[PDB]
């Protein structure tokens, strides 16, 4: 029942992203994507179904603080006995300070500084691939990860930070 807490958290997370993107950005499954997502590999894929849904818009900053929204949301809606496990997944995924009561602000500072980096915001390769290191699954049950696409390099940046924090929990 330990796995199911996380898997549910990841499916809750995906829902909140594909929603907060159409509600807090003008995103639609049929909108055009400035940058498409050609391929999604996992280096060590031990039971993680990988899917790429394009939910693209044009306002990247909204795409960004909207995905910020989904994360802070899926965080506090968790048990504080579970929100207690996020600080490690921070250092594990992003080699950054932990904390269970200031972590929403830690992710914010990172993405507001990384996804806002030129090397990130200014790379606009129309076909970009996405690659994660390790991702795991419950013995009978696959972790189902959807790489929602935004189209703008900024947006897809924030998506990937979360995918780190999400694939860094699947370690269990």
């Amino acid at each position, epitope marked *: 029942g330990a796995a199911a807490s996380i898997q549910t958290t990841v499916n809750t997370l995906s829902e909140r992203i594909s929603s907060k993107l159409e509600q807090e950005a003008n995103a639609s499954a049929q909108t055009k994507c400035d940058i498409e*997502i*050609g*391929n999604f*590999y996992i*280096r060590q894929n031990h039971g993680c179904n990988i899917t790429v849904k394009n939910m693209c818009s044009a306002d990247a900053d909204a795409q960004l603080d909207a995905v910020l929204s989904a994360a802070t949301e899926t965080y506090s809606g968790l048990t504080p006995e579970q929100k207690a496990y996020v600080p490690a997944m921070f*250092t*594990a*995924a*992003l*080699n950054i300070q932990t904390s269970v009561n200031t972590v929403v602000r830690d992710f914010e500072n990172y993405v507001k500084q990384t996804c806002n*980096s*030129s*090397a*990130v915001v*200014d*790379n*606009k*390769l*129309k*076909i*970009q*691939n*996405v*690659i*994660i*290191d390790e991702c795991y699954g419950a013995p009978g049950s696959p972790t189902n990860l959807e790489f929602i696409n935004t189209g703008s*390099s900024k947006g*897809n*940046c924030a998506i*990937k*930070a979360l995918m*780190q924090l999400t694939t860094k929990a699947t370690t269990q």
Partner: nanobody
Amino acid sequence: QVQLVESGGGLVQAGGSLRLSCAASGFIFHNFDMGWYRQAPGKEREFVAAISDNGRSTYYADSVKGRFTISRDNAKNTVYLQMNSLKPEDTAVYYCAVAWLSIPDLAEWYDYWGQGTQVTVSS
């Protein structure tokens, strides 16, 4: 175990040309979108060029478009930055690294960044 290595740089008079190379070892390169980036003294890093894994899609920063050309040899596991019409404003440490969305671990991002080769274009 993943090592990128960048070579080809030096001193060339403005309006000159240089071919920059990046040897790749440690991973399946043909799988990897790659980029050239640069960092000058005082300025933060700047995106310059981007190649698709295969090499069919590319992208260039607005201040190098037309004068720069990124490329790859998936047989030799190498990325080239053909640099023409250089300007003293291109003087910098140049880095082939992995495209960000295509970095496996954001906690060890440095492993997908080379150490650099320098280019001093003079008046």
